[PDB]
Structure formats: C-alpha cells, structure tokens
Amino acid sequence: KNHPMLMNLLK
Amino acid sequence: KLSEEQQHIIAILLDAHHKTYDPTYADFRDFRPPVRPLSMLPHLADLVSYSIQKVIGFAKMIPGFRDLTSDDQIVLLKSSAIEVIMLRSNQSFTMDDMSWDCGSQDYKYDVTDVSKAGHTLELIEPLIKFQVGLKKLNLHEEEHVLLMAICIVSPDRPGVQDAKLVEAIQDRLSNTLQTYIRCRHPPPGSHQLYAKMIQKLADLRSLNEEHSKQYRSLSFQPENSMKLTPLVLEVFGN
Ligand SMILES: CCC(O)(CC)CS[C@H](C)C1=CC[C@H]2/C(=C/C=C3C[C@@H](O)C(OCCO)[C@H](O)C3)CCC[C@]12C
C-alpha cells in the first residue's frame, strides 16, 4: 500500500 | 522421512541464506561510522537498512513466497523484518561476552551501543536473553534458515489478505522442519526442539512489539527520524 522501495526490491 | 521435496526446500533455503548473509561483514565499511547521545543510531540505522535488504532477498527465495499477492508479500516483510533481523543476527552474536561480533572491534556491538541507539533495557534485556536462548538450542544451519522462513510467512500477520495461502505455504515449511528434526537431529538435542523453536517465534512477537514502541517514540522526534534511512522509514513505518 505505497511501499515503493520495498516493492521495487521484491519485483 | 523427508521427501525429495523437503530436502529440496532445505537446499533452497540454505543457498538463499548463503547469498544474503556475508560472514566476512565486508559491507559494514559502507555504513556511517559507529560512534561510541544516540551516537550509535546512524551506524545501527545503516546496519538495519542493509539487513532489511538482505532479509527481502532471502524472503523472495522462500518456496511459494512468490505466489502471494504483491500486497501480501509487502505485509509479511514489514511485520517480520525486525524479527528476522533479530533472528539472523544470532549468527554474529557471541555468548563469550553477550555481544554481536561482526568481524572487528568497530563492528562489535554490545548493550551500551544499543543503548546509544535510543533503546532501553525493556527491549535490550529480553533481546539478549532471546539471543542467549536461541544460541542454547545449537540449531543446525538447516533449522536456522527454516525458522527464518517460517517467521516470514506467518498467517496471523496484521493486514494479511490471503491468510489461507500464507498458512498453506508455512505449513509446508513447518512440516519440513518437524520432519528434519526427527530424521536429522540426534537426541538429546532434538528433545522438544520444534516446540522450543516455535516458542522463539512467540518471543519474537513480543520483541517486535516492544521494539515498535521504542521505535515510534524514537522516530517521533524529527531529529532522530532524520538519522534513519529511507528504506528503514518505509518498512518500519513513517
Ligand atoms: C534502526 C532501528 C533500531 O531499532 C534503532 C532505533 C536499531 S537497534 C535494535 C535493538 C537492533 C535490532 C537488531 C539488533 C542487532 C543486529 C545485528 C546484525 C544484523 C544482521 O542482519 C547482520 O548480518 C550481516 C549479514 O547479512 C549481523 O549479524 C549483525 C544488534 C544491535 C541492535 C540491533 C541493530
């Protein structure tokens, strides 16, 4: 829910 | 008796750990220098930020983790991050002097250093006791990586969506651990080993709880929040 950095590291 | 899949799961987790935990601790040189009010916060904040990155990399390799929703993956990491860091840190912790020894004196952290990061005994004491108790289990590296993976994929995490799927994935990891202990952990060290490890997960929820309180208090003042990292703020909350 809007965690840019965390999401990027998970992609 | 440990199917091919269960052995497969373990081999995968061992490799994932090996690719995310560098025992040489060479990267610590990139962190802001440790200084021994809150003189250790810049350094430990960087340490934690680096660690969050490694725990994320570990998590993505957990068999089945990739099948969860982007939202679920996010929820699990935000809630378990601090727990897995405390858990993985047991590898550098040494009962010789109850400190986290990461290769050198500069990178050897003790109670006073944590204190210099803004924390109180209410967290530190039970944290050392946890490290002490975890070390007492003398877990096989296989058991260590399975516990971190089980910690990450917990169904009761706040905000979890597809709890059913998360539980299913964890169950496969739990059954893998239970069976590994029975088949590979010789007595007397295996006695009640599983229950003891699950109890460590309970200890971590408590530690998570206390850490979050001291973190919110600490991060409530802009000047402290200013010393953290962008990743730390995003993951541990803003
Ligand atoms: C930034 C957030 C803080 O709460 C400060 C406001 C940090 S202090 C807090 C009590 C804490 C949690 C983990 C603890 C510790 C962790 C240590 C390590 C993390 C681990 O990921 C490291 O592995 C490097 C290989 O990937 C190494 O074992 C040392 C010991 C000192 C205090 C630490 C930083």
CA nearest ligand 1 atom 14, residue: B86
Q: For chain A, how many residues are written? A: 11
B99: helix, strand or coil = strand
Q: Which domains does chain B have, with CATH numbers?
A: 1-238 (1.10.565.10)
Q: Give the resolution to one decimal, in Å.
A: 2.0
B45 Cβ inside 6 Å of ligand 1: yes
Nearest residue of A to residue B76 by CA position?
A6
Confirm or reject contact between A8 and chain B (CB < 8 A).
no
Query: CB within 8 A of B223, min separation 6: which ones?
Result: none
Cβ proximity of B26 and B43 under 8 Å: no
Please count the other Cβ atoms lying within 10 Å of the Cβ belonging to residue B66. Answer: 12
User: With an 8 Å Cβ cutoff, is A3 touching chain B?
Assistant: yes
Whether A4 sits inside 8 A of B234 (CB atoms) is: yes
Instruction: Report the sign of the C-alpha dihedral through residues B156, B160, B163, B165, in that order.
Output: negative
B43: which 2 tokens? 């350094």
CA distance B2 to B202: 26
With residue B45 as reference, give the H or E element that holds it. helix B41-60
Size of interface A-B (CB pairs under 8 A): 30
Measured between beta carbons, which residues in chain A are less than 8 angstroms from residue B70?
A: 7, 10
What is the enclosing helix (H) or strand (E) of B94?
strand B93-94
Q: Compute and round to an integer the Cα radius of gyration of chain A.
A: 6
Ligand 1 atom closest to residue B123's alpha carbon, by position in its atom list: 10
**Which one, of B236, B238, B185, lies nearest residue B52 by Cα?**
B236
Contact of B197 with B137, CB cutoff 8 Å: yes
Is the CB of B13 within 6 Å of ligand 1?
no
DSSP string, B157-213: -TT-S-HHHHHHHHHHHHHHHHHHHHHHS-TTTTTTHHHHHHHHHHHHHHHHHHHHH
